[PDB]
Amino acid sequence: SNQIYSARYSGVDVYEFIHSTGSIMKRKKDDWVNATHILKAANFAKAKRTRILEKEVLKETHEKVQGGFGKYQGTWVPLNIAKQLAEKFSVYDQLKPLFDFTQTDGSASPPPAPKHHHASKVD
């Protein structure tokens, strides 16, 4: 719901919130949104999301996250245009929290996403 964590990957930070696709990432440059959370949140990720998403995002700043960078968004879109399409028949409702923003009610705010230390895998 309002679970809005902060993360930084691919040299650009993004937002990771659980929604229709679970965690949703966003591009810091233009704060893009994973069209899946907007389209997949109302159409599930199936052969439909492959076209509806590609046809909806492909033309609407659709970015595919691969390699571990932006794998939380997958198909994020320009928040300026994403929120305009989501408010339509996307998740305008389920995104109540994502759009509300988790503001610190004045109480010490916890750190962004879970802090995890990378392990050393020597070949």
Coordinates of all heavy atoms in Angstrom, one line a residue, residues 8-88:
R8 N 18.8 2.8 -5.1 CA 19.6 3.5 -6.2 C 20.3 2.4 -7.1 O 21.1 1.7 -6.6 CB 20.6 4.3 -5.5 CG 22.0 3.8 -5.7 CD 22.9 5.0 -6.4 NE 24.3 4.7 -6.0 CZ 25.3 5.4 -6.4 NH1 25.0 6.3 -7.3 NH2 26.5 5.1 -6.1
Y9 N 20.0 2.4 -8.3 CA 20.7 1.3 -9.2 C 20.9 1.9 -10.6 O 20.3 2.9 -11.0 CB 19.7 0.2 -9.3 CG 19.7 -0.5 -7.9 CD1 18.5 -0.7 -7.2 CD2 20.9 -1.1 -7.4 CE1 18.5 -1.4 -6.0 CE2 20.9 -1.7 -6.2 CZ 19.7 -1.9 -5.5 OH 19.7 -2.5 -4.3
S10 N 21.8 1.3 -11.3 CA 22.1 1.8 -12.7 C 22.5 3.3 -12.7 O 22.3 4.1 -13.6 CB 20.8 1.7 -13.5 OG 20.3 3.0 -13.9
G11 N 23.2 3.7 -11.6 CA 23.6 5.1 -11.5 C 22.4 6.0 -11.3 O 22.5 7.2 -11.0
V12 N 21.2 5.5 -11.3 CA 20.0 6.3 -11.1 C 19.1 5.7 -10.0 O 18.9 4.5 -9.9 CB 19.2 6.3 -12.4 CG1 18.8 7.7 -12.7 CG2 20.2 5.7 -13.5
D13 N 18.7 6.5 -9.0 CA 17.8 5.9 -7.9 C 16.4 5.7 -8.4 O 15.9 6.3 -9.3 CB 17.9 6.9 -6.8 CG 16.7 6.7 -5.8 OD1 15.7 6.2 -6.3 OD2 16.9 7.1 -4.7
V14 N 15.7 4.8 -7.8 CA 14.3 4.6 -8.2 C 13.4 4.3 -7.0 O 13.9 4.2 -5.9 CB 14.3 3.4 -9.1 CG1 15.3 3.6 -10.2 CG2 14.7 2.1 -8.3
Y15 N 12.1 4.1 -7.1 CA 11.2 3.8 -6.0 C 10.8 2.3 -6.0 O 10.4 1.8 -7.1 CB 10.0 4.7 -6.2 CG 10.5 6.2 -6.2 CD1 10.9 6.7 -7.4 CD2 10.5 6.9 -5.0 CE1 11.3 8.0 -7.5 CE2 11.0 8.3 -5.1 CZ 11.4 8.8 -6.3 OH 11.8 10.1 -6.4
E16 N 10.8 1.7 -4.9 CA 10.4 0.2 -4.9 C 9.2 0.0 -4.0 O 9.3 0.0 -2.8 CB 11.6 -0.5 -4.4 CG 12.7 0.5 -3.9 CD 14.0 -0.3 -3.7 OE1 14.5 -0.7 -4.7 OE2 14.5 -0.3 -2.6
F17 N 8.0 -0.1 -4.5 CA 6.8 -0.3 -3.7 C 6.0 -1.6 -4.1 O 6.0 -1.9 -5.3 CB 6.0 1.0 -3.9 CG 5.0 1.1 -2.7 CD1 4.8 2.4 -2.2 CD2 4.3 0.0 -2.3 CE1 3.9 2.6 -1.1 CE2 3.4 0.2 -1.2 CZ 3.2 1.5 -0.6
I18 N 5.4 -2.3 -3.2 CA 4.7 -3.5 -3.6 C 3.3 -3.1 -4.2 O 2.6 -2.3 -3.6 CB 4.5 -4.3 -2.3 CG1 5.8 -4.1 -1.5 CG2 4.3 -5.8 -2.7 CD1 6.8 -5.2 -1.8
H19 N 2.9 -3.7 -5.3 CA 1.6 -3.3 -5.9 C 1.0 -4.5 -6.7 O 1.1 -5.6 -6.2 CB 1.9 -2.1 -6.8 CG 1.8 -0.9 -6.0 ND1 2.8 -0.4 -5.2 CD2 0.8 0.1 -6.0 CE1 2.4 0.7 -4.7 NE2 1.2 1.1 -5.1
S20 N 0.5 -4.3 -7.8 CA 0.0 -5.4 -8.6 C 1.1 -6.3 -9.0 O 1.0 -7.5 -9.0 CB -0.7 -4.8 -9.9 OG -2.1 -5.1 -9.9
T21 N 2.2 -5.8 -9.4 CA 3.4 -6.6 -9.7 C 4.3 -6.8 -8.5 O 5.4 -7.3 -8.6 CB 4.1 -5.8 -10.8 OG1 3.4 -6.0 -12.1 CG2 5.5 -6.4 -11.0
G22 N 3.9 -6.4 -7.4 CA 4.7 -6.5 -6.2 C 5.5 -5.2 -6.0 O 4.9 -4.1 -5.8
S23 N 6.8 -5.3 -6.0 CA 7.6 -4.1 -5.8 C 7.7 -3.3 -7.1 O 7.9 -3.8 -8.2 CB 9.0 -4.6 -5.5 OG 8.9 -5.5 -4.4
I24 N 7.5 -2.0 -7.0 CA 7.5 -1.1 -8.3 C 8.7 -0.2 -8.2 O 8.9 0.5 -7.3 CB 6.2 -0.4 -8.3 CG1 5.0 -1.4 -8.1 CG2 6.0 0.4 -9.6 CD1 4.4 -1.2 -6.8
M25 N 9.5 -0.2 -9.3 CA 10.6 0.8 -9.3 C 10.3 2.0 -10.2 O 9.3 2.0 -10.8 CB 11.8 -0.1 -9.9 CG 13.1 0.7 -9.8 SD 14.5 -0.4 -9.6 CE 15.7 0.6 -10.5
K26 N 11.2 3.0 -10.1 CA 10.9 4.2 -10.9 C 12.3 4.9 -11.3 O 13.2 4.8 -10.6 CB 10.1 5.1 -10.0 CG 8.6 5.0 -10.3 CD 7.8 5.4 -9.1 CE 7.8 4.3 -8.1 NZ 9.0 3.5 -8.4
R27 N 12.3 5.5 -12.4 CA 13.6 6.2 -12.9 C 13.7 7.5 -12.2 O 12.9 8.4 -12.3 CB 13.4 6.3 -14.4 CG 14.8 6.3 -15.0 CD 15.0 5.0 -15.8 NE 15.2 5.5 -17.2 CZ 15.0 4.6 -18.2 NH1 14.7 3.4 -17.9 NH2 15.1 5.0 -19.4
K28 N 14.8 7.7 -11.5 CA 15.0 9.0 -10.8 C 15.0 10.2 -11.8 O 14.5 11.2 -11.6 CB 16.4 8.9 -10.1 CG 16.7 10.3 -9.4 CD 18.0 10.1 -8.6 CE 18.8 11.4 -8.5 NZ 17.7 12.5 -8.6
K29 N 15.7 10.0 -12.9 CA 15.8 11.1 -13.9 C 14.4 11.6 -14.2 O 14.1 12.8 -14.0 CB 16.3 10.4 -15.2 CG 17.7 9.8 -14.9 CD 18.6 10.9 -14.2 CE 18.7 12.1 -15.2 NZ 19.0 11.6 -16.5
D30 N 13.5 10.8 -14.7 CA 12.1 11.3 -14.9 C 11.1 10.6 -14.0 O 9.9 10.6 -14.3 CB 11.9 11.0 -16.4 CG 11.1 12.1 -17.1 OD1 10.0 12.4 -16.6 OD2 11.5 12.6 -18.1
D31 N 11.5 10.0 -13.0 CA 10.6 9.3 -12.1 C 9.6 8.5 -12.9 O 8.4 8.7 -12.9 CB 9.9 10.4 -11.3 CG 10.9 11.5 -11.0 OD1 12.0 11.3 -10.7 OD2 10.4 12.7 -11.2
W32 N 10.1 7.5 -13.7 CA 9.2 6.7 -14.5 C 8.5 5.6 -13.6 O 9.0 5.3 -12.6 CB 10.1 6.0 -15.5 CG 10.9 7.1 -16.2 CD1 11.7 8.0 -15.6 CD2 11.0 7.4 -17.6 NE1 12.3 8.8 -16.5 CE2 11.9 8.4 -17.8 CE3 10.5 6.8 -18.8 CZ2 12.2 8.9 -19.1 CZ3 10.8 7.3 -20.1 CH2 11.7 8.4 -20.2
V33 N 7.4 5.1 -14.1 CA 6.7 4.0 -13.3 C 6.6 2.7 -14.1 O 6.4 2.7 -15.3 CB 5.3 4.6 -13.0 CG1 4.5 4.6 -14.3 CG2 4.6 3.7 -11.9
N34 N 6.7 1.6 -13.4 CA 6.6 0.3 -14.1 C 5.2 0.1 -14.7 O 4.3 -0.3 -14.0 CB 6.9 -0.8 -13.1 CG 6.8 -2.1 -13.7 OD1 6.9 -2.3 -14.9 ND2 6.6 -3.2 -12.9
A35 N 5.1 0.4 -16.0 CA 3.7 0.2 -16.6 C 3.1 -1.1 -16.1 O 1.9 -1.2 -16.1 CB 4.0 0.1 -18.1
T36 N 3.8 -2.1 -15.8 CA 3.2 -3.3 -15.3 C 2.4 -3.1 -14.0 O 1.3 -3.5 -13.9 CB 4.4 -4.3 -14.9 OG1 5.3 -4.3 -16.0 CG2 3.9 -5.7 -14.7
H37 N 2.9 -2.3 -13.1 CA 2.1 -2.0 -11.9 C 0.9 -1.2 -12.3 O -0.1 -1.3 -11.6 CB 3.1 -1.1 -11.0 CG 2.3 0.1 -10.5 ND1 2.0 1.2 -11.3 CD2 1.7 0.3 -9.3 CE1 1.3 2.0 -10.6 NE2 1.1 1.6 -9.3
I38 N 1.0 -0.5 -13.4 CA -0.2 0.2 -13.9 C -1.0 -0.6 -14.8 O -2.2 -0.8 -14.7 CB 0.4 1.4 -14.7 CG1 0.5 2.6 -13.7 CG2 -0.5 1.8 -15.8 CD1 2.0 2.7 -13.3
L39 N -0.4 -1.3 -15.8 CA -1.1 -2.2 -16.7 C -1.2 -3.6 -16.2 O -2.2 -4.2 -16.1 CB -0.4 -2.1 -18.0 CG -1.0 -1.1 -19.0 CD1 -2.0 -1.8 -19.9 CD2 -1.7 0.0 -18.2
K40 N -0.1 -4.1 -15.8 CA -0.1 -5.5 -15.2 C -0.9 -5.6 -13.9 O -1.4 -6.6 -13.6 CB 1.4 -5.8 -15.0 CG 1.5 -7.1 -14.3 CD 1.4 -6.9 -12.7 CE 0.3 -7.9 -12.2 NZ 0.6 -8.0 -10.7
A41 N -1.0 -4.5 -13.3 CA -1.8 -4.5 -12.0 C -3.3 -4.7 -12.3 O -4.1 -5.0 -11.4 CB -1.5 -3.1 -11.4
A42 N -3.7 -4.4 -13.5 CA -5.1 -4.6 -13.9 C -5.2 -5.6 -15.0 O -6.3 -6.0 -15.4 CB -5.6 -3.2 -14.4
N43 N -4.2 -6.1 -15.5 CA -4.2 -7.1 -16.7 C -3.3 -8.3 -16.4 O -3.2 -9.2 -17.2 CB -3.8 -6.4 -17.9 CG -2.7 -5.4 -17.6 OD1 -2.8 -4.2 -17.8 ND2 -1.6 -5.8 -17.0
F44 N -2.7 -8.3 -15.3 CA -1.7 -9.5 -15.0 C -0.6 -9.5 -16.0 O -0.8 -9.0 -17.1 CB -2.6 -10.7 -15.0 CG -4.0 -10.4 -14.4 CD1 -5.1 -10.8 -15.1 CD2 -4.1 -9.7 -13.2 CE1 -6.4 -10.5 -14.6 CE2 -5.3 -9.5 -12.6 CZ -6.5 -9.8 -13.3
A45 N 0.5 -10.1 -15.7 CA 1.6 -10.2 -16.7 C 1.5 -11.5 -17.5 O 2.0 -12.6 -17.1 CB 2.9 -10.2 -15.9
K46 N 0.8 -11.5 -18.6 CA 0.6 -12.7 -19.5 C 0.9 -12.3 -21.0 O 1.3 -11.2 -21.2 CB -0.8 -13.1 -19.3 CG -0.8 -14.5 -18.5 CD -1.6 -15.5 -19.3 CE -2.9 -15.8 -18.6 NZ -2.9 -17.2 -18.1
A47 N 0.5 -13.1 -21.9 CA 0.7 -12.7 -23.3 C 0.1 -11.4 -23.5 O 0.5 -10.6 -24.4 CB 0.0 -13.8 -24.1
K48 N -0.9 -11.0 -22.7 CA -1.6 -9.7 -22.8 C -0.6 -8.6 -22.4 O -0.3 -7.6 -23.1 CB -2.7 -9.8 -21.9 CG -4.0 -10.0 -22.7 CD -4.9 -8.7 -22.5 CE -4.1 -7.5 -23.0 NZ -5.0 -6.3 -22.7
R49 N 0.0 -8.8 -21.2 CA 1.0 -7.8 -20.8 C 2.2 -7.7 -21.7 O 2.8 -6.6 -21.8 CB 1.5 -8.3 -19.4 CG 1.8 -7.1 -18.5 CD 0.5 -6.4 -18.2 NE -0.6 -7.4 -18.2 CZ -1.5 -7.4 -19.2 NH1 -1.6 -6.4 -20.0 NH2 -2.5 -8.3 -19.2
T50 N 2.5 -8.7 -22.5 CA 3.6 -8.7 -23.5 C 3.2 -7.7 -24.6 O 4.0 -6.9 -25.1 CB 3.7 -10.1 -24.0 OG1 5.0 -10.6 -23.8 CG2 3.3 -10.1 -25.5
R51 N 2.0 -7.7 -25.0 CA 1.5 -6.7 -26.0 C 1.0 -5.4 -25.4 O 1.5 -4.4 -25.6 CB 0.4 -7.5 -26.8 CG 1.0 -8.0 -28.1 CD -0.2 -8.3 -29.1 NE -1.0 -7.1 -29.1 CZ -2.1 -7.1 -28.4 NH1 -2.5 -8.1 -27.7 NH2 -2.9 -6.0 -28.4
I52 N -0.1 -5.6 -24.6 CA -0.7 -4.4 -24.0 C 0.4 -3.5 -23.3 O 0.5 -2.3 -23.4 CB -1.6 -4.9 -22.9 CG1 -2.9 -5.5 -23.6 CG2 -2.1 -3.8 -22.0 CD1 -3.0 -4.9 -25.0
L53 N 1.4 -4.2 -22.7 CA 2.5 -3.4 -22.0 C 3.4 -2.8 -23.1 O 3.6 -1.6 -23.2 CB 3.2 -4.5 -21.2 CG 4.4 -3.8 -20.5 CD1 4.2 -2.3 -20.5 CD2 4.5 -4.3 -19.0
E54 N 3.9 -3.7 -24.0 CA 4.8 -3.2 -25.1 C 4.0 -2.1 -25.9 O 4.6 -1.1 -26.2 CB 5.1 -4.4 -25.9 CG 6.6 -4.6 -26.0 CD 6.9 -6.1 -26.0 OE1 6.4 -6.8 -26.8 OE2 7.6 -6.5 -25.0
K55 N 2.8 -2.4 -26.2 CA 2.0 -1.3 -27.0 C 1.7 -0.1 -26.1 O 1.6 1.0 -26.6 CB 0.7 -2.1 -27.4 CG 1.1 -3.3 -28.2 CD 1.9 -2.9 -29.4 CE 1.1 -3.2 -30.7 NZ 2.1 -2.9 -31.8
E56 N 1.5 -0.4 -24.8 CA 1.2 0.8 -23.9 C 2.5 1.5 -23.5 O 2.6 2.7 -23.5 CB 0.5 0.1 -22.7 CG 0.9 0.9 -21.4 CD -0.2 2.0 -21.2 OE1 -0.1 3.0 -21.9 OE2 -1.0 1.9 -20.3
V57 N 3.5 0.7 -23.1 CA 4.8 1.3 -22.7 C 5.7 1.6 -23.9 O 6.2 2.6 -24.1 CB 5.4 0.3 -21.8 CG1 6.3 -0.7 -22.6 CG2 6.3 1.0 -20.7
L58 N 5.8 0.6 -24.8 CA 6.7 0.8 -26.0 C 6.5 2.2 -26.5 O 7.5 2.8 -26.8 CB 6.1 -0.2 -27.0 CG 7.0 -0.2 -28.3 CD1 6.5 -1.3 -29.3 CD2 6.8 1.2 -28.9
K59 N 5.3 2.7 -26.6 CA 5.1 4.1 -27.1 C 5.1 5.0 -25.9 O 5.4 6.2 -26.1 CB 3.7 4.0 -27.7 CG 3.8 4.6 -29.2 CD 2.5 4.3 -29.9 CE 1.3 4.6 -29.0 NZ 0.1 4.7 -29.9
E60 N 4.8 4.6 -24.7 CA 4.8 5.5 -23.5 C 6.1 5.2 -22.7 O 6.2 4.4 -21.8 CB 3.6 5.0 -22.7 CG 4.1 4.6 -21.3 CD 3.0 4.9 -20.3 OE1 1.8 5.0 -20.7 OE2 3.3 5.1 -19.2
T61 N 7.2 6.0 -23.1 CA 8.5 5.8 -22.3 C 8.5 4.5 -21.6 O 8.4 4.4 -20.4 CB 8.5 7.0 -21.3 OG1 7.2 7.4 -21.1 CG2 9.3 8.1 -21.9
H62 N 8.6 3.4 -22.3 CA 8.6 2.0 -21.6 C 10.1 1.5 -21.5 O 10.7 1.3 -22.5 CB 7.8 1.1 -22.6 CG 8.4 1.1 -23.9 ND1 8.4 2.1 -24.8 CD2 9.1 0.0 -24.6 CE1 9.1 1.8 -25.9 NE2 9.5 0.5 -25.8
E63 N 10.6 1.4 -20.4 CA 12.0 0.9 -20.2 C 12.0 -0.5 -19.6 O 11.4 -0.7 -18.5 CB 12.6 1.9 -19.3 CG 13.0 3.2 -20.1 CD 11.8 4.0 -20.4 OE1 11.2 4.5 -19.4 OE2 11.5 4.2 -21.5
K64 N 12.7 -1.4 -20.2 CA 12.8 -2.8 -19.6 C 14.0 -2.9 -18.7 O 15.1 -2.6 -19.1 CB 12.9 -3.7 -20.8 CG 11.8 -3.4 -21.8 CD 10.4 -3.5 -21.1 CE 10.5 -4.7 -20.1 NZ 10.9 -5.9 -20.8
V65 N 13.8 -3.3 -17.5 CA 15.0 -3.4 -16.5 C 15.6 -4.8 -16.6 O 14.9 -5.8 -16.4 CB 14.4 -3.1 -15.1 CG1 13.2 -2.3 -15.3 CG2 14.1 -4.5 -14.5
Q66 N 16.9 -4.9 -16.9 CA 17.5 -6.3 -17.0 C 18.9 -6.2 -16.5 O 19.6 -5.2 -16.5 CB 17.5 -6.6 -18.5 CG 16.6 -7.8 -18.8 CD 15.7 -7.5 -20.0 OE1 15.6 -8.4 -20.9 NE2 15.2 -6.4 -20.2
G67 N 19.4 -7.3 -16.0 CA 20.8 -7.3 -15.5 C 20.8 -7.0 -13.9 O 21.8 -7.0 -13.3
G68 N 19.6 -6.8 -13.4 CA 19.5 -6.5 -11.9 C 19.4 -5.0 -11.7 O 19.2 -4.6 -10.6
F69 N 19.4 -4.3 -12.8 CA 19.2 -2.8 -12.6 C 17.8 -2.4 -13.0 O 17.4 -2.4 -14.1 CB 20.2 -2.2 -13.6 CG 21.4 -1.7 -12.9 CD1 22.4 -1.1 -13.6 CD2 21.4 -1.7 -11.5 CE1 23.6 -0.6 -12.9 CE2 22.5 -1.3 -10.8 CZ 23.6 -0.7 -11.5
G70 N 17.0 -2.0 -12.0 CA 15.6 -1.6 -12.3 C 14.7 -2.9 -12.4 O 13.6 -2.9 -13.1
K71 N 15.1 -4.0 -11.9 CA 14.3 -5.3 -12.0 C 13.1 -5.1 -11.2 O 12.2 -6.0 -11.2 CB 15.2 -6.4 -11.5 CG 14.4 -7.5 -10.9 CD 13.7 -7.1 -9.6 CE 14.8 -6.6 -8.7 NZ 14.1 -6.6 -7.3
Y72 N 13.0 -4.1 -10.4 CA 11.7 -3.9 -9.6 C 10.7 -3.2 -10.4 O 9.5 -3.4 -10.2 CB 12.2 -3.0 -8.4 CG 12.8 -3.9 -7.3 CD1 14.1 -3.7 -6.9 CD2 12.0 -4.8 -6.6 CE1 14.7 -4.5 -5.9 CE2 12.5 -5.6 -5.6 CZ 13.9 -5.4 -5.3 OH 14.4 -6.2 -4.3
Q73 N 11.1 -2.4 -11.4 CA 10.1 -1.8 -12.2 C 9.8 -2.6 -13.5 O 8.7 -2.8 -13.9 CB 10.7 -0.4 -12.6 CG 12.2 -0.7 -12.9 CD 12.5 -0.4 -14.4 OE1 13.5 0.2 -14.7 NE2 11.7 -0.9 -15.3
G74 N 10.8 -3.1 -14.1 CA 10.6 -3.9 -15.4 C 10.2 -3.0 -16.5 O 10.9 -2.8 -17.4
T75 N 9.0 -2.5 -16.5 CA 8.5 -1.6 -17.5 C 8.0 -0.3 -16.9 O 6.8 0.0 -17.0 CB 7.4 -2.4 -18.2 OG1 7.9 -3.6 -18.7 CG2 6.8 -1.5 -19.3
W76 N 8.9 0.5 -16.4 CA 8.4 1.8 -15.8 C 8.1 2.8 -16.9 O 8.5 2.7 -18.0 CB 9.6 2.3 -14.9 CG 10.9 1.9 -15.6 CD1 11.0 1.4 -16.9 CD2 12.2 1.9 -15.1 NE1 12.3 1.1 -17.1 CE2 13.1 1.4 -16.1 CE3 12.8 2.3 -13.8 CZ2 14.5 1.3 -15.8 CZ3 14.2 2.2 -13.6 CH2 15.0 1.7 -14.6
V77 N 7.4 3.8 -16.5 CA 7.0 4.9 -17.5 C 7.1 6.3 -16.9 O 7.2 6.4 -15.7 CB 5.6 4.6 -18.0 CG1 5.6 3.7 -19.2 CG2 4.8 3.9 -16.8
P78 N 7.1 7.3 -17.7 CA 7.2 8.7 -17.2 C 6.1 8.9 -16.2 O 4.9 8.9 -16.6 CB 7.0 9.5 -18.5 CG 7.3 8.6 -19.7 CD 7.1 7.2 -19.2
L79 N 6.5 9.2 -15.0 CA 5.4 9.4 -14.0 C 4.5 10.5 -14.4 O 3.3 10.4 -14.1 CB 6.2 9.9 -12.7 CG 5.3 10.0 -11.5 CD1 6.1 9.9 -10.2 CD2 4.5 11.3 -11.6
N80 N 4.9 11.4 -15.2 CA 4.0 12.5 -15.7 C 3.0 11.9 -16.6 O 1.8 12.2 -16.6 CB 4.9 13.4 -16.5 CG 6.2 13.7 -15.7 OD1 6.5 13.0 -14.8 ND2 7.0 14.7 -16.1
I81 N 3.3 10.9 -17.4 CA 2.4 10.2 -18.3 C 1.9 8.9 -17.7 O 0.8 8.5 -17.8 CB 3.1 9.9 -19.6 CG1 4.1 8.8 -19.3 CG2 3.9 11.2 -20.0 CD1 3.4 7.4 -19.6
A82 N 2.7 8.3 -16.9 CA 2.3 7.0 -16.2 C 1.1 7.3 -15.3 O 0.1 6.7 -15.4 CB 3.5 6.6 -15.4
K83 N 1.3 8.2 -14.3 CA 0.1 8.5 -13.4 C -1.1 8.8 -14.2 O -2.2 8.6 -13.8 CB 0.6 9.6 -12.6 CG 0.5 10.9 -13.4 CD 1.1 12.1 -12.6 CE 1.3 11.6 -11.1 NZ 0.4 12.5 -10.3
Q84 N -0.9 9.4 -15.4 CA -2.1 9.8 -16.2 C -2.8 8.5 -16.8 O -4.0 8.5 -16.9 CB -1.5 10.7 -17.3 CG -2.7 11.1 -18.3 CD -2.1 11.3 -19.7 OE1 -2.0 10.4 -20.5 NE2 -1.7 12.5 -20.0
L85 N -2.0 7.5 -17.1 CA -2.6 6.3 -17.7 C -3.1 5.4 -16.5 O -4.1 4.7 -16.6 CB -1.5 5.6 -18.4 CG -2.0 4.9 -19.6 CD1 -3.5 5.1 -19.7 CD2 -1.4 5.4 -20.9
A86 N -2.4 5.4 -15.4 CA -2.8 4.5 -14.3 C -4.1 5.0 -13.7 O -5.0 4.3 -13.5 CB -1.6 4.7 -13.3
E87 N -4.2 6.3 -13.4 CA -5.4 6.9 -12.9 C -6.6 6.5 -13.7 O -7.7 6.5 -13.3 CB -5.2 8.4 -12.9 CG -6.1 9.0 -14.0 CD -6.1 10.6 -13.8 OE1 -5.1 11.1 -14.0 OE2 -7.2 11.1 -13.5
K88 N -6.3 6.2 -15.0 CA -7.4 5.7 -15.9 C -8.0 4.4 -15.4 O -8.7 4.3 -14.5 CB -6.8 5.6 -17.3 CG -7.7 6.1 -18.3 CD -7.0 6.4 -19.6 CE -5.9 7.4 -19.3 NZ -5.5 7.9 -20.7

